[PDB]
Amino acid sequence: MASFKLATDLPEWKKLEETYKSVGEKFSVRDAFAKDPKRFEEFSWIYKNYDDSKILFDFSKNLVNKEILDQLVTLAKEAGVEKLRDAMFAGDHINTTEDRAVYHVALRNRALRKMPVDGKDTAQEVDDVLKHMKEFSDSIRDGSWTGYTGKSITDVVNIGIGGSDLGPVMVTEALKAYSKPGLNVHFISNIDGTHTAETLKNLNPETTLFLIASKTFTTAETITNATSAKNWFLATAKDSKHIAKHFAALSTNEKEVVAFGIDAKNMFGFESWVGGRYSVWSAIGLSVAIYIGFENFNDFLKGAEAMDQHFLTTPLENNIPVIGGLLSVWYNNFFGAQTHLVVPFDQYLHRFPAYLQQLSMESNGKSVTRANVFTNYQTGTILFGEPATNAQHSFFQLVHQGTKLIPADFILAAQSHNPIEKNLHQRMLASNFFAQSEALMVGKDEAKVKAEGATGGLVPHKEFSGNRPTTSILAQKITPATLGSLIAYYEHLTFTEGAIWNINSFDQWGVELGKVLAKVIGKELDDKKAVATHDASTNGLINQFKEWEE
Amino acid sequence: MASFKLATDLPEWKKLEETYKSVGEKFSVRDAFAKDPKRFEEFSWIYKNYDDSKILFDFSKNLVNKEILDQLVTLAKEAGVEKLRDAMFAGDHINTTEDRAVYHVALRNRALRKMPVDGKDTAQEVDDVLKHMKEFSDSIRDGSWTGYTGKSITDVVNIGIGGSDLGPVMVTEALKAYSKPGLNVHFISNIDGTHTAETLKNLNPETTLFLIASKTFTTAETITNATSAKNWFLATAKDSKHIAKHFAALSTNEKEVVAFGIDAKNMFGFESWVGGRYSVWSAIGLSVAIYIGFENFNDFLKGAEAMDQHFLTTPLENNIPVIGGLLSVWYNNFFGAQTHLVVPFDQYLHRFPAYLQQLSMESNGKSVTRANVFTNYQTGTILFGEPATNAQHSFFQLVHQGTKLIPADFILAAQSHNPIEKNLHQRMLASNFFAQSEALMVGKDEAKVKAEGATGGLVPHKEFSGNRPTTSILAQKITPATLGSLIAYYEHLTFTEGAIWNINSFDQWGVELGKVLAKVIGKELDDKKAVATHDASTNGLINQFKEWEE
């Protein structure tokens, strides 16, 4: 099914190795700007969203020029990025190891284009779930859906883990400006009983709604947590008939939902072709629709749809997510940089790096290609980040003066939702965004340090290399539509990387393994008898725990 | 001045390069356990805290054996780790570029040992500040300190950034079990006005106390934020005489505190020899003393002091923070692993990786040695993480099946503060801790994948290499004392790495530059005139921002 086996044996890969040696390794971004008066225009692109809002993607402080980008585009052609993308959008089963379609793009098909899986259009089935989400979220928000004592819901608790948790977390944080007073969202995800205890501590069963978010509806942590929540609820409500007003399910598995005691009328469904890390667009985003309202959730979907259309219809050389993915390959595979940093200059987006860390690393942390052979090259990068300006005071020291190349994406909105003090804070925030990427590029040489007053041995400690690359992403405003487009940009960047490496970006056998590993040891923790059934470390740790546990 | 110039000048560094090729590169941990029945005992150590509680540090699933560890210890001797450590504890000015002592260890000197800077003991000066912290925090907690309308304080807001923020955040989250209902803590740190707006939205000026946390008391972000808080307060209170009941300062700069309008009686001092990322033990920890009580905060200090005593007095071969630091150097410098993962199996510790990311990367992200020459070897690693079990469902995919070595530390308490359902959740959490480190070691070979039912091209996709290293840290319970010892473990690990590399772990010239960069561009943002004073990218981003800003 694959058209090639190994990225390293694409003809352009060895050409890029040669370009790395002659041009890339010692690339001077300062010299690039000096050579090319049109560099900013040539290496920046304006994305226009469906609502005519705009996002500037400026790649011009990267270690890249026309020659390098053209070679990377050739590599993408040789790798059949476009063929794989088209197959994704056709509903083909490109998740080859689970024999599944990969159809998050269908979730945000608000245009109702024909988008078939197994030869049947999905547009109406997706739309019908959205209709249900709108009805229900409207009823929560207008008080027509009351708790078992006729009170409006005040608190919504999502219970889920991984893909069934982190999108809801990140997007409700990101779009918190769009929420209403008195209607709050909460998250229980960890099996650690602290998460249950602390989240429920101050909540009222009469005014709390639970969403049990689980694709399979069999995940140990989620079902255990959901049982705990049901117990807490019934401790006050007493009668199980009242569960129908307080528990809903977001799932693909109706039989297990109903077995759990949730009415099928209170199930919001989705399909197997929605990966967890691509799921916030589905029924899994119900907490978002409740928190900010369905219209805002729908605008978020439409932002993703617009970026999908950009990705599908734009030649590679001007295709924004492809460009980002090509740069990632350049750094990962030619420079040997193992990490990718994402820094929102935006407090609402504080969980955006963690969300991307799941999307990226879970997709692309693979060692086997679509030809079912092991790679002889690096795949997925380690993605990390925190918001600025905080990050500037902390690990930015190492970004500026350490020994590791750390490609970084900085993101700013031109307009704040909270423009206090006639935009005093916002102008200060913006000034940091510009100045930090400028400093990473320009650096500060020995002569400048001397001129500034340092002498003798102090001088080298105050030098900065510069030529440290960044990508700057400037939005007008982080609206629902903008956020939709930004997530989809990273989805399709991730797609591009995986396509070049010839991996399946859409399975997760290490995550699936983790969901079956613990039960064997759990059974050994039912008593305090020493164990010797494992390696000596695992035995030592279990046995020490048995001595120290309650 | 330094006893050697470059780590590469030390004879054992070249010997380790040879050991890496002969034994390390292909190291089999499975074979190591099969060869050595005492391996768990030989590569695990029990730490005993001042309160007779215990922490097990199990390094036996690392890519290490007796030969390797003996060589790394020799390298520590050659690098003069012990000499530098002793100088640290002696109060010598080992922060050579700022000409400062490095004396966070003096902040937790509850035994009142003689600990002099510039030949003058610091014990009583440190202790006097702690007396003041105890008196003030007790008065907040018991209601004897009232707001300007005669009400007890309900909410305490710390305003500060970087080292003046993240310790307070992480430690109050970690020790939240020790808090009391009705006395909450909050943090404003980002310059982004969202942080101010969202934090203050539901607070009452009459019952809110602000702590303005700033070593210098000049940081742009903090003073801007503090001024916004003052203005919010005065909008309600009216008269500045009322500030004295609602604002305190945590600082080294009395003149600037008083200039801001805070009474010197409400200043809690510290000295220049406390680095921000080592400051939560000082007056900067006041929010912790208020939230959980001074006695708990003192027990936290005593845990650090006990780990200090361990680091100072233990031969290198059994010195727990040194062992951790030597393994980090092994992976960073000989395997070329760029990252270090920390995963607390503990929801309260969810900000622990972020705190350690600052400690580590801001200390050790340096390219110049104490002999004032550039390193052409790797220094600080990129540290990241998130809590388990969540992480198991996300980026653990790449940990298990990607192409990058990611040395990982897993941390579990045997006892939960929230042992709900007769410890059902806690046994489940623990089972995951043991099972994940076991699986990273043993992996899953081709034969086992076939036996489990896969055929043909599916098989390689479900294989796991194993021999992926972990360190397991098992505490009895994450009490204040335990957390103190755990942070000090990472401080001294960080110390060890930097001593081997011969860098100054205690300066931060990139963070310092950050604090003076934005001012030029901030003045350019005072109008909407196009700018041409920078490189074309910086100009283009500024100019697009001016078109899109309010």
Ligand SMILES: O=C(O)[C@@H](O)[C@H](O)[C@H](O)COP(=O)(O)O
């Ligand atoms: O990325 C993944 O597949 C996981 O993080 C899942 O979302 C997680 O295990 C929860 O699975 P489920 O939604 O089936 O409960």
Ligand SMILES: O=C(O)[C@@H](O)[C@H](O)[C@H](O)COP(=O)(O)O
């Ligand atoms: O690590 C550092 O030195 C910084 O993060 C500082 O803590 C931060 O810049 C705040 O400085 P100050 O405490 O002087 O306000």
Ligand SMILES: CN(C)Cc1ncccc1O
């Ligand atoms: C005509 N549609 C836009 C109505 C509608 N609204 C929300 C969800 C689905 C749906 O069909």
Ligand SMILES: CN(C)Cc1ncccc1O
């Ligand atoms: C003698 N000391 C233990 C009393 C004391 N308590 C708290 C802080 C300082 C201090 O001296």
Ligand SMILES: [Cl-]
């Ligand atoms: Cl629509």
Ligand SMILES: [Cl-]
């Ligand atoms: Cl004491």
